Amino acid sequence: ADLGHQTLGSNDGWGAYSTGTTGGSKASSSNVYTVSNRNQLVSALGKETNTTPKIIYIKGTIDMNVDDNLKPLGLNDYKDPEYDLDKYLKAYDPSTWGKKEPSGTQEEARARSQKNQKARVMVDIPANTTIVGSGTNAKVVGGNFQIKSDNVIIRNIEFQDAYDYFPQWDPTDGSSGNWNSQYDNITINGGTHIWIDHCTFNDGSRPDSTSPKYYGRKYQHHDGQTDASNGANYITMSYNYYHDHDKSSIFGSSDSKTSDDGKLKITLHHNRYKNIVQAAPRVRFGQVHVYNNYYEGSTSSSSYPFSYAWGIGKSSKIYAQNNVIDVPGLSAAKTISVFSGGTALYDSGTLLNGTQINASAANGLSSSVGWTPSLHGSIDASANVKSNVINQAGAGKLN
Numbered sequence: 001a002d003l004g005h006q007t008l009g010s011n012d013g014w015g016a017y018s019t020g021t022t023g024g025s026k027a028s029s030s031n032v033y034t035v036s037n038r039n040q041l042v043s044a045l046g047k048e049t050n051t052t053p054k055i056i057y058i059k060g061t062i063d064m065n066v067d068d069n070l071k072p073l074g075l076n077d078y079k080d081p082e083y084d085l086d087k088y089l090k091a092y093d094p095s096t097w098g099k100k101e102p103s104g105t106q107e108e109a110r111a112r113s114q115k116n117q118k119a120r121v122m123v124d125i126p127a128n129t130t131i132v133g134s135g136t137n138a139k140v141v142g143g144n145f146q147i148k149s150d151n152v153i154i155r156n157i158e159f160q161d162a163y164d165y166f167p168q169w170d171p172t173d174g175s176s177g178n179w180n181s182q183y184d185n186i187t188i189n190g191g192t193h194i195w196i197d198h199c200t201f202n203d204g205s206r207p208d209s210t211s212p213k214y215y216g217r218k219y220q221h222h223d224g225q226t227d228a229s230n231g232a233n234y235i236t237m238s239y240n241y242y243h244d245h246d247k248s249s250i251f252g253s254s255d256s257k258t259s260d261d262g263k264l265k266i267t268l269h270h271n272r273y274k275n276i277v278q279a280a281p282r283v284r285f286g287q288v289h290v291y292n293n294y295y296e297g298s299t300s301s302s303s304y305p306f307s308y309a310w311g312i313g314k315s316s317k318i319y320a321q322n323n324v325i326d327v328p329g330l331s332a333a334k335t336i337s338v339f340s341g342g343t344a345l346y347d348s349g350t351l352l353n354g355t356q357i358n359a360s361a362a363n364g365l366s367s368s369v370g371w372t373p374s375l376h377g378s379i380d381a382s383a384n385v386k387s388n389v390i391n392q393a394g395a396g397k398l399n
């Protein structure tokens with residue numbers, strides 16, 4: 001079968017559980033689409049009631065920041081009449097505003113501005129859908145695909161620059177505050193039976209090195225790359241290339257969402273993470289199988305310095321096998337970041353800078369996560385992971 005018609009293998013990660021991930025493989029003739037712009041994409045997807053098996057081939061570059069005539073939209077097109085960046089900055093300067101949450105005219109105007117862009121860039125993917133890139137140059141630019149449905153395959157697409165024109169200031173986010181934006185490339189919001197394979201995720205032509213600092217903090221236009229929240233379950237992400245981005249993959253969005261316990265069952269394998277700062281992945285609650293991934297970066301990089309690979313969040317149950325991390329000078333312990341409530345990590349075969357390490361033991365964590373993954377394909381020796389992943393991961397590697 002071609003990429004449009006292929007299904008997730010019956011052993012290929014958590015996505016293969018129960019009914020598995022077949023996407024729109026069973027699509028009838030009238031439900032196979034080829035799309036090359038936002039209008040065609042939105043027409044093909046339809047609404048949440050569009051649950052018939054469907055296949056969507058993406059041809060070329062699809063820019064999501066466009067109006068109904070496909071004319072590009074920017075800051076001044078989305079801006080609420082009452083919003084002004086200068087006045088926003090003046091209103092919420094810690095020097096005069098202090099550390100209270102931004103409120104009043106400018107923040108309300110920014111929120112409205114944000115919703116205006118959201119209307120264009122954010123799109124829901126209905127049940128029983130396969131979306132695949134045709135050829136080697138299929139791109140989604142500025143878009144945020146959201147999956148709340150069951151049974152969705154996304155493959156062979158380069159997702160670029162899910163860019164928010166209206167970052168929100170939060171003075172309480174961290175010890176010196178932070179700017180936060182709303183769009184990921186893909187958000188799995190309660191979505192189930194999902195395969196994301198051979199995709200590329202990056203910040204396009206607007207990397208964070210092109211954003212200024214306000215209040216001494218990066219004016220952050222991006223959020224996540226592939227995030228999963230709100231009971232998202234039975235997901236395989238394989239052979240993806242994540243690069244040049246801050247926060248990559250957050251699975252479980254809140255310590256308070258205890259209903260995520262027993263969910264967020266995600267398998268990540270053969271993914272490449274190059275110049276990713278953090279959260280690759282950051283996990284709360286979930287039984288997450290992380291195997292044969294390759295991580296490369298620098299702690300001293302001027303654009304996207306390495307912070308950590310695995311985030312051991314509250315009640316996380318990461319099961320890691322034969323992953324390879326290449327970050328000069330990094331200690332075994334600092335391969336991961338442990339957050340309150342994170343107490344356990346299974347890792348075997350972890351290679352740091354060519355040396356076998358035990359990331360869990362280096363951090364005083366229990367090696368018992370209470371499960372062993374049965375749904376997986378062949379496991380590469382750590383020795384071959386770097387080569388295999390560099391050669392095979394990302395969009396434009398099949399076609």
Ligand SMILES: O=C(O)[C@H]1O[C@H](O[C@@H]2[C@H](O)[C@@H](O)[C@@H](O)O[C@@H]2C(=O)O)[C@H](O)[C@@H](O)[C@H]1O
Pocket residue numbers: 173174178180223224247250252253254282311339
């Ligand atoms: O900004 C986000 O997407 C995340 O915010 C929180 O992250 C923390 C900090 O805000 C962030 O700058 C970095 O230091 O990581 C922190 C963390 O991972 O805890 C939330 O905890 C995340 O779920 C996410 O919303």
Ligand SMILES: [Ca+2]
Pocket residue numbers: 173178180
């Ligand atoms: Ca944050």
Ligand SMILES: [Ca+2]
Pocket residue numbers: 181223224
């Ligand atoms: Ca976020």
Ligand SMILES: [Ca+2]
Pocket residue numbers: 182183184187223224227
């Ligand atoms: Ca997100």
